[PDB]
Symmetry: D2
Subunit: 225 residues, 4 copies
């Protein structure tokens, strides 16, 4: 059988960010993927999504927001700042808090967060976004060891240079300027495919990774090494 045989996976914002490749990889490995499209910025929405989903073995916390490439600290206004937190930080705790009771009842569970390498090292021109990804990384760091006492794994994929619409859309990655910047800063010298990212998520969602607790795994071609 497949590496997620029998498992049911709740995927947030399934059309956005890394959702499409998650569905493809996880379904090929036998999982039933609940592809949710609910806006989890609404208070109370997370508990409703979880109640409607039924039995959940794996939560894939898939959240993204415009990074506002090139916007400076002085141009990072109140609304831009707040929107980073409203979009990817507060919903992360809402959805995790909603799924953890059934994980705790069964003394088993899996949470995979698609995050950012901007939560690990300086990424130029993405200030509010970086701080919000740091907050996500902190949530995994703080919740991870707490949830591990209930045999629940929580882990953070610190991705960069990976194909997606929000940060590496086809038009952006085609220019000469982008290509020279990627060759300078990415040791592997290429972008990751979305599938490669979902293959790491697959490892972290599977029962092959039970000993990995509260970790940030840098998925960035060597950028932050």
């Amino acid at each position: 059988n497949g590496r997620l045989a029998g498992k049911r996976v709740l995927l947030t914002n399934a059309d956005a960010y890394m959702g499409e490749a998650t569905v493809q990889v996880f379904e090929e490995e036998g999982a039933e993927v609940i592809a949710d499209h609910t806006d989890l910025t609404k208070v109370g929405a997370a508990e409703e999504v979880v109640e409607r989903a039924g039995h959940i073995d794996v939560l894939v916390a898939n959240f993204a927001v415009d990074a506002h490439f090139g916007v400076t600290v002085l141009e990072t206004d109140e609304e831009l700042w707040q929107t980073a937190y409203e979009t990817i930080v507060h919903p992360l705790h809402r959805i995790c808090r909603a799924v953890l009771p059934q994980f705790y009842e069964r003394n088993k569970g899996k949470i995979v967060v698609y995050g950012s390498a901007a939560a690990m090292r300086y990424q130029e021109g993405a200030l509010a976004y970086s701080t919000a990804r740091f907050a996500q990384r902190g949530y995994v760091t703080a919740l991870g060891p707490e949830a591990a006492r209930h045999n629940v794994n929580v882990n953070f994929i610190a991705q960069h240079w990976t194909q997606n619409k929000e940060y590496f859309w086809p038009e952006r990655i085609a220019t000469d300027e982008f290509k020279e910047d990627m060759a300078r800063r990415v040791p592997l010298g290429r972008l990751a495919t979305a599938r490669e990212d979902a293959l790491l998520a697959l490892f972290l969602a599977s029962d092959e990774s039970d000993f990995i607790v509260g970790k940030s795994i840098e998925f960035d071609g060597g950028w932050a090494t």
Copy 2:
């Protein structure tokens, strides 16, 4: 003195590490503007800076109840939001307010009193830890941007340091606390608030211009 002629803007001066900052920095010749304005209000940071006038050093001193022992399932919406409202959003407001004059002079200093809960897992302090992580991320992301203007932004990742918010005199006398500290703090003691302010003094002084966007662990070895 090591801060001779310098003017220092200190937020929430009666809270957290404020008192020791005044004492140490004034000892070294600084004029310390001991502000007590609530920076959770939009617009307050700009008014504080305009009234302060010339600022050489910003000490970003923010604290919030960590709610020690509260689990993930009991971290409700209001507790979570209050952590960010109290120590995260105001940090960008006050830094964004001081940077313009630093950029005109191509010189500035920002020191953030943070937490070692932004570096490693600290039991029973969930929302608080994530808010300190956000502050650490602000220093990590702003640091290299501001350094192009010769402005230093750095983060003190403190733990086991005397203060009212986290190590108030009652809590440090329990049996569980003393052997907690003995087991997990290699140095075997709490830091004085003065010792913390002496690190902030180094990072606020012109002896530390090459330190950019760094998290300095001030924890008696806890996170080593």
Copy 3:
């Protein structure tokens, strides 16, 4: 349809440390495992092993030495200090330098190092050993991005609380101090089995992990989180 189908894996010190589970897990996924038992502390031995081996797709750098638990800084004499470096540091460069030419020729390769969480954070009473593991972590950090330009992945497993004879022999597990660490310092509250560690190595040796470059992956039940 094994995840290492068609691959040939050179495993050092194959009976020691993490070698036996590596053989079992990798062979179940279709790999041919060249299980070497050569003493690589001897200059020249690494190139001779690699020449004899023929075509290599994956190097598993499996090195261990007595940690000398409880030996203090003042009791760490010249011989004990040198032996840590001779046993797990110098051989690591020799065997990697020996394998890299054929990886570079094919613009493809995989190196997985079984290291230690002592390379990440303070571990009580294992001084010379910790510094030698830090040196191994440094080797992965420094080599990783250099080798990635040739599409070669080099990664470090920073393990702790994992089944092996060298560090978790039966009498240690029976001590009050170990039980205290499992209650207080290991969030998951158990040892990993060697299988689980080999499953992380399998991921890092497979073509599912080509975007992972020069990383230290903490395999420690949450201990360093």
Copy 4:
């Protein structure tokens, strides 16, 4: 002075960051024992300490040619061994020699001039990086052990700092160097040797007793 009445043992005082250490530490009242002994020799460290007598601070100043540009395939046995022989094994010899008197007094200070190559990938410096990582590991592992005796051991992870071994005048004078440096260093300049010594001064002073087994990145933001 901030080191008034202190005696400081400085290794390899002619090399690396030694000259700036002498200048800054003597300005602050220290007596600096400027040792030039070859500590790759077994037995030498204990004789250095015996001759020095009472030591309050050890500044572990070790350097070796980084062999910039030499690839993994050209890092031969001799190049590799020389890195460890020059900056790794002597570090334990000299710390082991000074710790006994620190332990009698329950007080001591060790500052290691290391490298930011012990923190993140530095291109073209393979053997050197791994040897600096080993130094960082020594501080990380010894720090908490020594802190039990109120001894501080800390690591300066420096880069882009003026010295003869890595950033010598002829190397840093060219336009190619200055252009590459402006791209990789957020602060956009090299540090002076004195600035590095001012960090060592803080870590050697009694203002830094709560800092235990830490790596402080001294690199203008390079590794941030």
